[PDB]
Design a protein around this ligand. Structure first.
Ligand SMILES: OC[C@H]1O[C@H](O)[C@H](O)[C@@H](O)[C@@H]1O
Ligand SMILES: OC[C@@H]1C[C@H](O)[C@@H](O)[C@H](O)O1
Length: 266
């Protein structure tokens, strides 16, 4: 019924002064009951009939025909309730809150609370609690959840990659010289273990998540004396290096799983 308020809002005549409230502001159901009464009464006072669209025409015309002006009590109530929502939040503020959720994940409220311009940490924390409680009221909840879940998936992938790379590197005294990969059937025909060892080790050294890391890797390969005569590896694009590194990460992850399952024996 509130769902249906926002849809029709976002023709049939409306009162000129009608307050603009938005779903993400989390006003109470009752407010909408009163605002709806004002709208139906306004229709009553002007000509308004409701067009063809028989059974469903009668029920809508009835709401107008039976409408009454708000009592003095109701007017006061409506005025109080017009501040029982997040009046300081614009749509832009809301969108920034969602962006912060996508960037940091739901749980990291310390970082979200510092990432909504013009809002105090206290204000974001207050908002956040009501949001998660009532987010099912939001017209756009599907898209919003998909956006937040996609950011949370990326944070989890990053944490998995970091863990997997750190554990692998920790098994060698001198990984740039000693690191071996378990290839199974995905080695391919192009890259060598000498090349792959440098890719993994140097990606890890530079920071696998670092902005523009695949161009820095490309420059580091070019500079390594070990590749003076290796035209192949020096001529790979940044995109090609990222693709190969993604394969190598997956092999390390598959290897880390089998090692944790051999340990499980004991
Ligand atoms: O205090 C200055 C204000 O600057 C910005 O608007 C911040 O977003 C807000 O957190 C802070 O309260
Ligand atoms: O999975 C949704 C997330 C995961 C996490 O365990 C929980 O603390 C958070 O609020 O919900």
């Amino acid at each position: 019924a509130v769902d249906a308020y926002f849809r029709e809002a976002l023709k049939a005549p409306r009162p000129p002064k009608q307050p603009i409230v938005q779903d993400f502001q989390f006003f109470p159901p009752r407010l909408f009951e009163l605002l709806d009464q004002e709208i139906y009464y306004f229709r009553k006072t002007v000509g308004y009939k409701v067009p063809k669209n028989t059974k469903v025409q009668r029920e809508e015309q009835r709401k107008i025909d039976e409408a009454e002006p708000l009592t003095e009590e109701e007017i006061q109530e409506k005025e109080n309730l017009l501040s029982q929502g997040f009046t300081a939040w614009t749509k832009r503020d809301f969108n920034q809150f969602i962006k912060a959720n996508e960037k940091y994940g739901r749980d990291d409220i310390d970082n979200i609370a510092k990432d909504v311009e013009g809002k105090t940490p206290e204000e974001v924390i207050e908002y956040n609690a009501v949001f998660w409680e009532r987010c099912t009221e939001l017209q756009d909840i599907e898209r919003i959840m998909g956006q937040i879940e996609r950011g949370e998936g990326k944070i989890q992938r990053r944490l998995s990659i970091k863990k997997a790379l750190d554990q692998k590197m920790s098994r060698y005294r001198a990984p740039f010289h000693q690191l071996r990969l378990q290839y199974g059937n995905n080695k391919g025909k192009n890259y060598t273990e000498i090349e792959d060892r440098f890719l993994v080790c140097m990606l890890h050294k530079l920071g696998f998540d670092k902005e523009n890391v695949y161009e820095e890797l490309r420059a580091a390969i070019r500079a390594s004396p070990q590749f003076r005569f290796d035209w192949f590896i020096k001529s790979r694009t940044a995109l090609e290096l990222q693709r190969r590194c993604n394969t190598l990460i997956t092999l390390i992850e598959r290897e880390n799983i089998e090692l944790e399952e051999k340990e499980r024996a004991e």
